[PDB]
């Protein structure tokens, strides 16, 4: 009965444990370690894990990881020992080791334990945020394509800075000639000389700071345009739109809405404010606030195809969230009415295809994406949409890779496509090629938040290969 | 976690939420996750 003597020592250590006498419980567990036959892996791993619990209440995290480690050697799939070591590594700032332990925990649990997944999600965000910060320091900025720049400014009508010409004047001519890399220089000459186009150059320089991914240099310019009350209200409203979007990009919903609300108050008929705020309201699932902004866009732009396509999709999300099939079909038929009234609005088809995919009509959604290729053949994002469709629809990873690769041929500076290709290589099991695609998107991401998400995908991939080695 | 992309249409920003969901399932549907 040599094993009964080990459990007897373990059971008295449990009574010291419940009385708060952890040092005396540790000695009983140590006595149980000695009396357990080496042939009994499970019982011996139990005794090590119990002693790690006593070390945990004393908050001696080093001894916790040590005892959990020995317990895993006897019971390699001891989920309680692996998870306790993951918590121990978190306290010791062993984030990579904590991620690897909690990765094995989630796999053994079938991803069914919210407690384990919250810990993995917590350490993944921290690891990705750290690397995104250090990489964003000395990252060289890339100027996006002219097609992206013109599409960005075409989403504004009241910005002034994009208007044609009838320091800053030289910057406006470099812009009309698509020589964007020298716009920031000529704008600084106005600000340094404090000319009459000072607020415009301050706003135009901040815009291209954002366009090259330098949100840290755009913030002081946006702050300054907003502080100048004498400046044109159109320039302050446009600067508040861009500072609010940057706030939302940095996970600041409250400051974002404050800037958008102030933009609407100081410039009540600026349709850019209602257009860009409503798009954020949809992303935040604040639907009734979105239709209100999109209804104002229609009121201010009664002939705009996109404005009615927006509101039609906003009405759909309202029916989708309330789950009335009568209202859902009402808004679904509204899409077919929008595409007939505006047959060359590609976003009308894309918003419809999203609603079709949300409601399982994949074949018709692929047709709407095909129509976008007819109208706009050089739009790479539509091929990303078709690729994402092939994953949700048929799980055809080969055809999905070909469509995502097609978007790269059109726009090799599309970080969204590289992220989708790495996601596919994870699903196929090619972890090294997946990290390869994630890194190419990192060097292309436009914000630090996007870069942190991509770095998290890398650490999750690397952690799985380490778990695979055992 | 709203990952907002600069200068993108609404349909593209909607696809980010779809990509996030597909990334979660991709890591749960890897050879190492099923063989353990």
Numbering used by the authors:
A (entry chain C): 109 to 274, 297 to 600
B (entry chain B): 43 to 78
According to the publication:
We determined the crystal structure of the hTOM70 ΔN2/SARS-CoV-2 orf9b complex to 2.2 Å. While the majority of hTOM70 residues were visible in our final structure, we found a central portion of SARS-CoV-2 orf9b (residues 43-78) was bound to hTOM70, but the remnant of orf9b was disordered. The visible portion of SARS-CoV-2 orf9b adopts a helical conformation: The N-terminal region of the fragment folds into a “U-turn” shaped loop that is followed by a long, slightly bent helix and a short helix; the C-terminal region of the fragment extends towards the proximity of hTOM70 NTD. This is in stark contrast to the β-sheet-rich conformation adopted by the same fragment in the orf9b homodimer. Of note, multiple salt bridges (distance 2.7–3.3 Å) were identified between E549, H583 of hTOM70, and R58, E65 of orf9b, suggesting their importance in the interaction. (2) We identified 23 non-polar residues on the surface of the CTD pocket interacting with SARS-CoV-2 orf9b. Collectively, we identified a highly flexible region of the CTD-pocket of hTOM70 associated with orf9b binding.
Orf9b is a unique accessory protein of SARS-CoV-2 and SARS-CoV. It is implicated in immune evasion by targeting mitochondria, where it associates with the versatile adapter TOM70.
